[PDB]
UniProtKB/Swiss-Prot annotation:
Disulfide bonds: none annotated. The chain holds residues 170 to 208 of 323 of the full protein. The chain crosses the membrane at residues 13-33. This is Voltage-dependent calcium channel gamma-2 subunit. It is found in: Membrane; Synapse, Synaptosome. It comes from Homo sapiens.
Length: 42
């Protein structure tokens, strides 16, 4: 006990990649719904 292990570096890059990929996905759904609403009207 009392080892004080650190999660250090690029494990955080995996975490940031999660956040970035999810923001990408939600913007993709934005593009779908707006692009379909464009061919709705007249």
């Amino acid at each position: 006990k009392k080892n004080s292990y650190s999660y250090g570096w690029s494990f955080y890059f995996g975490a940031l990649s999660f956040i970035i990929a999810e923001m990408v996905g939600v913007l993709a759904v934005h593009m779908f719904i707006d692009r379909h609403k464009q061919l709705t009207g007249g």
